[PDB]
Amino acid sequence: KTVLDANLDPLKGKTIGVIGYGNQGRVQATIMRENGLNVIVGNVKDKYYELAKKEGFEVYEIDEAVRRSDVALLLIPDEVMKEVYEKKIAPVLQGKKEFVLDFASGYNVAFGLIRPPKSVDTIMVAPRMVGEGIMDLHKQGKGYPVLLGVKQDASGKAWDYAKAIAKGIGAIPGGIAVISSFEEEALLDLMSEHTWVPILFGAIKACYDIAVKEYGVSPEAALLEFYASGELAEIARLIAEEGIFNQMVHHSTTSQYGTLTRMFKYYDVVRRIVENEAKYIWDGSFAKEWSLEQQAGYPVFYRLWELATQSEMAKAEKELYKLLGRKVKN
Amino acid sequence: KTVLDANLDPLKGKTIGVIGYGNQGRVQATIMRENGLNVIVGNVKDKYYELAKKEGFEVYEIDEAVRRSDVALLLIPDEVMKEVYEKKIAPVLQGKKEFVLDFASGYNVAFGLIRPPKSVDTIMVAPRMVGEGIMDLHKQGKGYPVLLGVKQDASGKAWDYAKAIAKGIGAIPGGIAVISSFEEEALLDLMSEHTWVPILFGAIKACYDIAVKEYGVSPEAALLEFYASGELAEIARLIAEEGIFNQMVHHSTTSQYGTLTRMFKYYDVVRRIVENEAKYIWDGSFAKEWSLEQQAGYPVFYRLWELATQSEMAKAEKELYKLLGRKVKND
Amino acid sequence: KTVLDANLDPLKGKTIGVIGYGNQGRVQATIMRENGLNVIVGNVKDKYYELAKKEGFEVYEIDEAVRRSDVALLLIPDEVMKEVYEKKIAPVLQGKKEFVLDFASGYNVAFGLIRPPKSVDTIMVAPRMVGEGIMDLHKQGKGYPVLLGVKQDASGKAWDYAKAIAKGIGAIPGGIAVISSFEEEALLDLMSEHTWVPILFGAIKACYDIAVKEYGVSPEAALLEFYASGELAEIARLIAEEGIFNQMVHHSTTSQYGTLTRMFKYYDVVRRIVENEAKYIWDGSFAKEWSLEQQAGYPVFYRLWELATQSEMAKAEKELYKLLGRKVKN
Amino acid sequence: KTVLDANLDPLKGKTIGVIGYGNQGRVQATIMRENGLNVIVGNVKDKYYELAKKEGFEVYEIDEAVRRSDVALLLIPDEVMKEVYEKKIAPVLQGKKEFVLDFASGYNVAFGLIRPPKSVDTIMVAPRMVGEGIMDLHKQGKGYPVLLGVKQDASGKAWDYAKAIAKGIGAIPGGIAVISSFEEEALLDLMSEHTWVPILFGAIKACYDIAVKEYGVSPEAALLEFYASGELAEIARLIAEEGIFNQMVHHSTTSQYGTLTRMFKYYDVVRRIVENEAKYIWDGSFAKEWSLEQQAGYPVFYRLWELATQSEMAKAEKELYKLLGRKVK
Numbered sequence A, C: 001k002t003v004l005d006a007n008l009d010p011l012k013g014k015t016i017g018v019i020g021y022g023n024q025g026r027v028q029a030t031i032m033r034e035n036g037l038n039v040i041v042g043n044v045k046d047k048y049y050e051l052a053k054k055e056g057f058e059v060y061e062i063d064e065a066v067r068r069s070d071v072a073l074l075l076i077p078d079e080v081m082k083e084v085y086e087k088k089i090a091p092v093l094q095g096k097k098e099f100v101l102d103f104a105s106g107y108n109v110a111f112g113l114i115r116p117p118k119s120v121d122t123i124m125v126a127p128r129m130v131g132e133g134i135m136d137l138h139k140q141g142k143g144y145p146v147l148l149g150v151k152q153d154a155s156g157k158a159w160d161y162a163k164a165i166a167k168g169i170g171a172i173p174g175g176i177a178v179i180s181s182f183e184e185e186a187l188l189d190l191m192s193e194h195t196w197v198p199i200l201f202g203a204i205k206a207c208y209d210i211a212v213k214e215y216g217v218s219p220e221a222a223l224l225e226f227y228a229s230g231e232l233a234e235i236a237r238l239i240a241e242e243g244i245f246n247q248m249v250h251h252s253t254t255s256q257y258g259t260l261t262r263m264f265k266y267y268d269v270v271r272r273i274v275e276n277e278a279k280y281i282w283d284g285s286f287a288k289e290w291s292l293e294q295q296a297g298y299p300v301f302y303r304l305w306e307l308a309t310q311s312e313m314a315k316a317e318k319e320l321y322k323l324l325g326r327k328v329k330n
Numbered sequence B: 001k002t003v004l005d006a007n008l009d010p011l012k013g014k015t016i017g018v019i020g021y022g023n024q025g026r027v028q029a030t031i032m033r034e035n036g037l038n039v040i041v042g043n044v045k046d047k048y049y050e051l052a053k054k055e056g057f058e059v060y061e062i063d064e065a066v067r068r069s070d071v072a073l074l075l076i077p078d079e080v081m082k083e084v085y086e087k088k089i090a091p092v093l094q095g096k097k098e099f100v101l102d103f104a105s106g107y108n109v110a111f112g113l114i115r116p117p118k119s120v121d122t123i124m125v126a127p128r129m130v131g132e133g134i135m136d137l138h139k140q141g142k143g144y145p146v147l148l149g150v151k152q153d154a155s156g157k158a159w160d161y162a163k164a165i166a167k168g169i170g171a172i173p174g175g176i177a178v179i180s181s182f183e184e185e186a187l188l189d190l191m192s193e194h195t196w197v198p199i200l201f202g203a204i205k206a207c208y209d210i211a212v213k214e215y216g217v218s219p220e221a222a223l224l225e226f227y228a229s230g231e232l233a234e235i236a237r238l239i240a241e242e243g244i245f246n247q248m249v250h251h252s253t254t255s256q257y258g259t260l261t262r263m264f265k266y267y268d269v270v271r272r273i274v275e276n277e278a279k280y281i282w283d284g285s286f287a288k289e290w291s292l293e294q295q296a297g298y299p300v301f302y303r304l305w306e307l308a309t310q311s312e313m314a315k316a317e318k319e320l321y322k323l324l325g326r327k328v329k330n331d
Numbered sequence D: 001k002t003v004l005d006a007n008l009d010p011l012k013g014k015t016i017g018v019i020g021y022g023n024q025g026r027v028q029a030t031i032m033r034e035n036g037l038n039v040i041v042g043n044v045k046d047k048y049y050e051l052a053k054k055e056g057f058e059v060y061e062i063d064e065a066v067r068r069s070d071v072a073l074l075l076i077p078d079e080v081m082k083e084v085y086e087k088k089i090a091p092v093l094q095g096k097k098e099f100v101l102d103f104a105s106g107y108n109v110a111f112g113l114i115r116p117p118k119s120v121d122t123i124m125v126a127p128r129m130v131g132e133g134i135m136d137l138h139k140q141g142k143g144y145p146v147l148l149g150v151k152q153d154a155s156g157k158a159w160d161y162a163k164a165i166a167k168g169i170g171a172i173p174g175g176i177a178v179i180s181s182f183e184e185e186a187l188l189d190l191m192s193e194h195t196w197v198p199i200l201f202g203a204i205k206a207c208y209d210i211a212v213k214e215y216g217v218s219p220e221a222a223l224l225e226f227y228a229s230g231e232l233a234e235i236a237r238l239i240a241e242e243g244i245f246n247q248m249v250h251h252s253t254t255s256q257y258g259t260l261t262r263m264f265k266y267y268d269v270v271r272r273i274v275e276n277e278a279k280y281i282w283d284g285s286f287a288k289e290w291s292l293e294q295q296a297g298y299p300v301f302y303r304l305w306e307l308a309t310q311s312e313m314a315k316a317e318k319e320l321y322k323l324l325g326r327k328v329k
């Protein structure tokens, strides 16, 4: 069902050479060392190689690490990890007896872009926070939830390495850790980025556009109600803590009837959408969709940014942020 | 028109360089030696160089090969020729007077991925066997048919090279050799892979799925009728010698009427399909479809294999193969 | 479940009457006399009267036969069995204490065209082979699978007689034997004759027709690729032992992506075509659909044969068989 | 390409044992005797029997006929011919080595309901007339057209027997005879009975029904213009003689433009129809459609007759025929 803790046996004697010192590269670093592990760190000699050395991690080059450690936490992007894996690590992978390879998210594994040896223990360890607030909870010794699983194993005890890191990063005890597979992680992390999020923006991008152009509302008026307030975020504290559906008591009845009746009116209008995009991911199209834009130079990515920023809404909103006293993007 | 045989004049005095020694390697290789020609062979040093070494071919690398021969039999995949042709051969092609390129199939030529010199003759030589069974028919004398044609020539003495290599490969005499172009072969070799083959699988992947989940058949029951028996492959022999439509006498009348009526009921449902996929090939979309997923790292290819093997059908069929005593894969 | 073997008790102390000696006659005939049982055989005097008792099996007429046996293996067509059952056997059926009545396939039972007495042991024993090769499976000792079941019983041991006859036919042991009902047999044997087979022909009858009349291929060219070769041998024999899907390894990658992507494209296009036909069988229409044509002298059957043989394809393919030296229709 | 005549060689030294003496019975019978051929005749004993014998035919029973004749003109219906062919003729068919078998129309052959030996000469001889007027075309000597062909031969000269009978029936010389096969005959004879004829009736059954109920015309008024006059049948003679499209010259211009423009307006509305019915015949359904109705006792056939006769149109038309002084049914 769900795990709460495990023995912390294996990794006392084996070394862990971490790769990357990004956002997650700074949260896992602090914890495993502060829970009983000798560790070195990996990052190419740019600005980041000088900082985490000030954390006492005797940082070397990337390939210096995997040639020492039986583990490597590849806390680096899900996009350029391809480039690394075939210049450096694969010539290093085949030249090894045993190795335990872990990732954060599996946009590259689940969609088949990585096929490591059968001499390697494959696992996943997914934090479920943006990366900043996690440091408010670790100081509190507070666990937090993680997703796990396996793609490939040749050891029998591949899971305890994950359950070890499941206690190595301090995410448990206090929280929980889910058993799963790689497919069921990348599916969700992208489903948020396809179906429920962007529709939130379109409605806010349409209701405003529908108010001014058609129904005559002034631009400065509307945005104070839709999202320029903190209600759309201050609501989220209730959801994470007081629950989704009990949240509606804190708005009066006249908002409930208007909201619940429509939630079921326009339910089948969006389940039809989600059935398409998920099937557009289970097949791996979104990887072949993205992985060619990279091989063209981000044309569309450039344009749509050149529209939404230069759209009608941010125009009038930039005057608001110019008028509430906050910053103004160059 | 359909030819049977020709003179075997030109290649007496020109060395037969050969590239690749794969499945079609051993097909054409020991026939040109057997029917009286000199050969050097091309391949890249790996396990296939071993069995290639055991057969008396005096083998060099590829660049040294074409620097000797006026002909070449590029019996290598239809996918990595692009890699080879621009590293090795093209710097050698422009440094060659006259040369005659032969291929198996033209997925790369017909779709324009290869632009050889004007100083070169171009031909196609396609067998229509899988590759294994030729030495059951070859030593037996009864040959097998081939397809031919031209894309580009600057010689006027072109077709005899193909008709020469046609005897170089032993598929003639006894068999035949069809006159055609590059387009009309690569069109067909994929039309099988798009329209009539996969629909065969879907129906078998639906009728089973429709029997169990809706009509209550046990899974171990059905598969013994659909394809796991000697019903399907055993009748391919009747179609090969006794003819397609005369095959149906060997099933009684109650099976005939149910089949012929539906063959014409659901004909316009599939011609409707085939009109689309062929036009999706005549234009070259399928090459621009394949050419990119290569340049992404086989994402979709990985997934569908990760579905059909992990689907419902193979699961219960893997238990069957675990139960008839035959092999079952380590995966 | 998949039963493998049983005691062979019941069929000792009787005589095994058998009706019909067609293809499946000599299949089962050879084995009951081989595996230690007494037999008389039933067939109505024609050429088959020659070869049947020429192999030793004593013969009386059918009415002279079923009166001797408690069992009977009606290995005759699924079409004219109606004619026999009401002239001869039914006047003989009522004149029995017990009786055991077995068939090969149940196009006549499951669709209600036979309703035997109350004291008959009704069973099914279905081979799943064409009939010829069974001696290539038999003398190697390897069994092969059979389908079974019951419709109407008044004896308590309706299944042991089937399991008894199951060992009387040589298909077990070594192979298997499935428990089922009559409905689940005729459903499949006809579904192959309705959905996946004829579509195989139409595509081959369309792609060729579409190549020549629209895309300019010469007729002698195409057929050498589609089906005029024995390529279908070396693709489905792989399916017989090397598996449906693992056979794709023996075709290169470019033939896979073109095939698997389309198998899922045109899946829902054919599941419709199956659902409409199976429901046309579960209701019993196809038995009525045949049964009236039989009562009109095979008009349509005569015509479609006068089309498919006189079509464009055989008009050209016959000249190829006229040209490879293989047999032409004599 | 078309034939006009042949040598009259084969049928000398034989006897032509005819079966049936119906409407076409007296068509072919009178002529074969009166152009130099010996004949016996076949018909099962009813009122029709002795009238042929009253005209000199040495008649016997049916099965008597075939054993005296290498030929058999089966001038009988296309429906009960099945009943005969398996009770009587099939036990008799193998009595001959060579035997010749001729029909009028092939609703039973082309749709596969007959499969004779491979030692029998199979042919078709189709007159194209009702049967009454042939003895107006005959005495004047002017021939008339026929359709021919073969289904099965085991003799090498299956055609001169047809070209022989082609002079046995007198339809040539003077006329023509077309080369064809069985399929291309039954296709046409039924296509007339499916597409162009019944639509003629429906329009006449609708335009009237549309005039009275909707647009207010009286019933006695309209029918005098639509079909109760002999114009419509007199519109036909000009077609048979002066040709289809030159026929319209005898109607003034205001009727032409109203007719030609609509002939092309509502063309694809009926080609869309005909494509369905012919394919409903080429596959052989209409024989299976009919053949089962015979095996159910003509239920529908009874009803539609019980409707169209008891419809609104014949009701008011029967009063008109009751009013012009002609018959009343």
Ligand SMILES: NC(=O)C1=CN([C@@H]2O[C@H](COP(=O)(O)OP(=O)(O)OC[C@H]3O[C@@H](n4cnc5c(N)ncnc54)[C@H](O)[C@@H]3O)[C@@H](O)[C@H]2O)C=CC1
Binding pocket: A020, A021, A022, A023, A024, A025, A043, A044, A048, A075, A076, A077, A078, A080, A084, A104, A105, A127, A128, A129, A130, A131, A132
């Ligand atoms: N705070 C966040 O945004 C969270 C990130 N993740 C996961 O973290 C992983 C990466 O995210 P972050 O690094 O934390 O944020 P980030 O976007 O700031 O990543 C920057 C990192 O990329 C590294 N890098 C990229 N290419 C490199 C190359 N050729 N050589 C050396 N270093 C290279 C750099 O060292 C740098 O540290 C992803 O897989 C993601 O799934 C998961 C939860 C939230």
Ligand SMILES: NC(=O)C1=CN([C@@H]2O[C@H](COP(=O)(O)OP(=O)(O)OC[C@H]3O[C@@H](n4cnc5c(N)ncnc54)[C@H](O)[C@@H]3O)[C@@H](O)[C@H]2O)C=CC1
Binding pocket: B020, B021, B022, B023, B024, B025, B043, B044, B048, B075, B076, B077, B078, B080, B104, B105, B127, B128, B129, B130, B131, C250, C251, C252
């Ligand atoms: N059953 C089949 O696969 C048949 C093959 N063909 C055609 O023959 C050609 C190739 O067929 P096969 O070689 O027999 O199949 P294959 O998949 O077994 O090819 C492997 C062979 O190609 C060579 N090779 C492979 N990759 C190479 C690379 N990167 N660099 C250098 N050499 C490499 C190797 O020497 C190896 O022996 C294709 O055009 C194919 O369409 C046509 C008839 C049947």
Ligand SMILES: NC(=O)C1=CN([C@@H]2O[C@H](COP(=O)(O)OP(=O)(O)OC[C@H]3O[C@@H](n4cnc5c(N)ncnc54)[C@H](O)[C@@H]3O)[C@@H](O)[C@H]2O)C=CC1
Binding pocket: B250, B251, B252, C020, C021, C022, C023, C024, C025, C043, C044, C048, C075, C076, C077, C078, C080, C104, C105, C127, C128, C129, C130, C131
């Ligand atoms: N390859 C096959 O045909 C197989 C046959 N079966 C089943 O076996 C049964 C019949 O199969 P077969 O006899 O082998 O095929 P078949 O169509 O060749 O039947 C020939 C036999 O039927 C007998 N027969 C035919 N007409 C008869 C009649 N009017 N009166 C009396 N006897 C007549 C004859 O004695 C002859 O021996 C069916 O239930 C069929 O489903 C099942 C597995 C495969």
Ligand SMILES: NC(=O)C1=CN([C@@H]2O[C@H](COP(=O)(O)OP(=O)(O)OC[C@H]3O[C@@H](n4cnc5c(N)ncnc54)[C@H](O)[C@@H]3O)[C@@H](O)[C@H]2O)C=CC1
Binding pocket: D020, D021, D022, D023, D024, D025, D043, D044, D048, D075, D076, D077, D078, D080, D104, D105, D127, D128, D129, D130, D131
């Ligand atoms: N106006 C027409 O109906 C024409 C007739 N035909 C063809 O002539 C053939 C039959 O036409 P007709 O005989 O002239 O019309 P009919 O309907 O008047 O036939 C009645 C004749 O057929 C015989 N007969 C009827 N029922 C019989 C039965 N149960 N058993 C034995 N004999 C029976 C009788 O001797 C009787 O004289 C058909 O094949 C038809 O296609 C073709 C051209 C025109």
Ligand SMILES: O=C(O)C1(C(=O)O)CC1
Binding pocket: A251, A252, A255
């Ligand atoms: O913010 C809301 O949702 C309000 C409501 O009750 O409708 C205005 C207070």
Ligand SMILES: O=C(O)C1(C(=O)O)CC1
Binding pocket: B231, B251, B252, B254, B255, C105, C189, C190, C193
């Ligand atoms: O006659 C049939 O329907 C069978 C077939 O295999 O197609 C024997 C069962």
Ligand SMILES: O=C(O)C1(C(=O)O)CC1
Binding pocket: B105, B189, B190, B192, B193, C251, C252, C254, C255
């Ligand atoms: O690789 C292919 O496409 C071939 C096939 O037969 O399917 C060999 C030609």
Ligand SMILES: O=C(O)C1(C(=O)O)CC1
Binding pocket: D251, D252, D255
């Ligand atoms: O019969 C016709 O068609 C008439 C016309 O000229 O319109 C009335 C005479």
Ligand SMILES: [Mg+2]
Binding pocket: none
């Ligand atoms: Mg970088």
Ligand SMILES: [Mg+2]
Binding pocket: A189, A190, A193
């Ligand atoms: Mg994501």
Ligand SMILES: [Mg+2]
Binding pocket: A189
């Ligand atoms: Mg996420």
Ligand SMILES: [Mg+2]
Binding pocket: B044
């Ligand atoms: Mg290689």
Ligand SMILES: [Mg+2]
Binding pocket: B188, B189, B190, B193, C255
């Ligand atoms: Mg191909």
Ligand SMILES: [Mg+2]
Binding pocket: B189
């Ligand atoms: Mg091929």
Ligand SMILES: [Mg+2]
Binding pocket: none
């Ligand atoms: Mg019989």
Ligand SMILES: [Mg+2]
Binding pocket: B254, B255, C189, C190, C193
């Ligand atoms: Mg069947």
